[PDB]
Design an enzyme around this catalytic site. Structure first.
Site, PDB file in Angstrom:
ATOM      1  N   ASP A 182      -6.273  11.645   1.414  1.00 19.56           N
ATOM      2  CA  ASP A 182      -6.595  10.515   0.564  1.00 19.56           C
ATOM      3  C   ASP A 182      -7.518  10.901  -0.603  1.00 19.56           C
ATOM      4  OD1 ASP A 182      -9.059  10.669   1.807  1.00 19.56           O
ATOM      5  OD2 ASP A 182      -9.102   8.581   2.468  1.00 19.56           O
ATOM      6  N   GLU A 234       0.797  -1.230   0.000  1.00 18.03           N
ATOM      7  CA  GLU A 234       0.000   0.000   0.000  1.00 18.03           C
ATOM      8  C   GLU A 234       0.831   1.282   0.000  1.00 18.03           C
ATOM      9  OE1 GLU A 234      -2.938  -0.027   3.171  1.00 18.03           O
ATOM     10  OE2 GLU A 234      -4.059  -1.509   1.989  1.00 18.03           O
TER      11      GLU A 234
END
Ligand SMILES: CCCCCCCC/C=C\CCCCCCCC(=O)OC[C@H](O)CO
Ligand SMILES: CCCCCCCC/C=C\CCCCCCCC(=O)OC[C@H](O)CO
Ligand SMILES: CCC(CC)Nc1cc(C)nc(Oc2c(C)cc(C)cc2C)c1C
Ligand SMILES: CCCCCCCC/C=C\CCCCCCCC(=O)O
Length: 407
Positions: free
Chosen positions: A125, A116
């Site tokens: 994000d 990730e």
């Protein structure tokens, strides 16, 4: 006596070379050559093999008439032999980076840092929520000012937006526990998770992070097979899901972890980073040295000791610095072993101890020789004979040592 010291040197070099070669073949035969431990040891042995073999070539350079002439191939041998000298230091530094990281950072941390990604600064994000680390969401306030605070409660300390690597680990460990809680509450996932071993559990957690509990639950037949330890067949079914199609690489690694049981999938990726430290970095160093010799020291096959101008410090320099760093690593490792890991007795901590014990044993053997080098009776004979033995059997000690760690 000088002839005696020479005889001992040739004898030792022969012994260490054979020993190294035997150790190398051992590591290649092993199915554990896949483990990161063994990749480093095998490369460390190779680095040592090369130097011993080059020693015998260097012996040919020594004869005066070649030494004086400073032929082209003579200079190559000297450079090559020095290159391998730095390679030795940097590979040893390789083991020290690994050991240090081994204690401070868990396997599951490393797996999901490749998959990730690790961002040490606060970032927004995809949907605009503030997130730091390996996919950790702080809060859903639109004000980054508020986010800095929310991180502070989590970590315990004021952050200013940026957390230490060791801090990200704590955030990540927290998330893993949350993932496990979710897994245990899930009726479908729970029997499977409980049956799996630690490495495979990690692979299950990997999918939880990417898909969610509900998403991973959808794989009915794959998990059945997993539960019945049918790893080969379980792997076949995992691909067919489109998870694989959208993110092949991560899927392949995660699926492969189910099959084998090991970290082999992630370990290869890690190994390239060690490779640069051991073979990559000492190469520009030696190239810069060789230029230096061409410029101001073109005599004597590059092996002439001239007081003079210090050119050997171009390669000797980093060798020394790498060593100091390893001491700092060692200092930190030993303290951790007392500080938190007294009562731990895990599979990782036992090995780390075994390594530290062996490092401490290895370190005077190789180190004395350097100590004797700075400082210069029948006892004088004993100094030289000791020196001759230590340098020559330097390789043998490494062969034994690597084998002891592998066991
Ligand atoms: C002119 C010469 C200059 C050349 C410069 C050499 C340095 C670049 C080397 C590697 C780049 C490619 C690396 C790609 C490998 C990444 C593998 C991985 O970690 O990613 C998997 C993926 O993210 C999950 O789907
Ligand atoms: C005998 C006269 C000729 C001189 C020859 C020199 C003798 C020493 C050379 C080899 C020993 C190498 C040490 C091997 C240590 C065995 C323990 C070991 O761990 O073996 C398993 C291996 O690690 C699985 O990867
Ligand atoms: C000193 C001369 C050199 C010649 C090869 N030997 C070295 C070189 C280096 C860099 N580290 C060594 O040991 C360590 C240290 C100091 C720390 C850690 C964490 C791990 C290891 C294996 C030795 C014995
Ligand atoms: C973590 C290791 C840091 C590596 C930085 C140096 C990059 C490698 C240098 C030269 C390799 C070229 C061959």
């Amino acid at each position: 006596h000088y002839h005696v010291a020479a005889i001992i040197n040739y004898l030792g070099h022969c012994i260490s070379l054979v020993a190294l070669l035997v150790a190398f073949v051992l590591f290649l035969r092993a199915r554990s050559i896949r483990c990161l431990r063994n990749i480093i040891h095998a490369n460390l042995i190779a680095a040592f093999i090369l130097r011993n073999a080059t020693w015998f070539v260097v012996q040919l350079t020594m004869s005066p008439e070649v030494h004086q002439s400073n032929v082209g191939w003579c200079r190559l041998v000297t450079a090559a032999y020095n290159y391998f000298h730095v390679t030795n230091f940097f590979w040893m530094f390789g083991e020290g980076c690994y050991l240090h990281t081994a204690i401070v950072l868990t396997n599951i941390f490393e797996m999901l840092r490749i998959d990730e990604g690790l961002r040490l600064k606060i970032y927004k994000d995809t949907e605009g929520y503030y997130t730091i680390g390996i996919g950790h969401l702080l809060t859903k306030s639109p004000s980054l000012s508020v986010a800095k605070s929310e991180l502070d409660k989590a970590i315990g300390r004021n952050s200013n937006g940026v957390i230490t690597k060791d801090e990200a680990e704590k955030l990540f460990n927290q998330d893993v526990d949350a993932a496990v809680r979710g897994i245990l509450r899930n009726a479908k996932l729970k029997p499977v998770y409980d049956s799996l071993d630690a490495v495979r559990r990690s692979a299950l957690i990997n999918m939880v992070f990417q898909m969610g509990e509900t998403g991973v639950a959808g794989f009915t037949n794959s998990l059945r097979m997993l539960q019945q330890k049918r790893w080969d067949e379980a792997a076949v079914n995992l691909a067919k899901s489109r998870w694989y199609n959208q993110t092949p690489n991560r899927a392949k690694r995660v699926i492969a972890t189910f099959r084998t049981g090991t970290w082999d999938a992630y370990d290869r990726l890690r190994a390239w980073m060690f490779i640069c430290i051991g073979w990559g970095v000492p190469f520009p160093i030696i190239v810069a040295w060789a230029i230096g010799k061409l410029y101001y020291d073109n005599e004597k096959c590059w092996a002439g000791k001239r007081p003079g101008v210090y050119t050997d410090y171009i390669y000797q320099g980093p060798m020394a610095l790498v060593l100091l760093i390893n001491f700092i690593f060692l200092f930190n490792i030993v303290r951790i072993l007392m500080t938190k890991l007294r009562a731990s007795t895990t599979s990782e901590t036992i090995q780390a101890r075994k390594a530290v014990k062996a490092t401490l044993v290895l370190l005077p053997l190789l180190g004395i020789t350097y100590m004797l080098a700075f400082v210069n009776e029948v006892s004088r004979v004993v100094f030289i004979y000791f020196n001759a033995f230590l340098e020559s059997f330097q390789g043998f000690f490494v062969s034994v040592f690597a084998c002891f760690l592998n066991s």
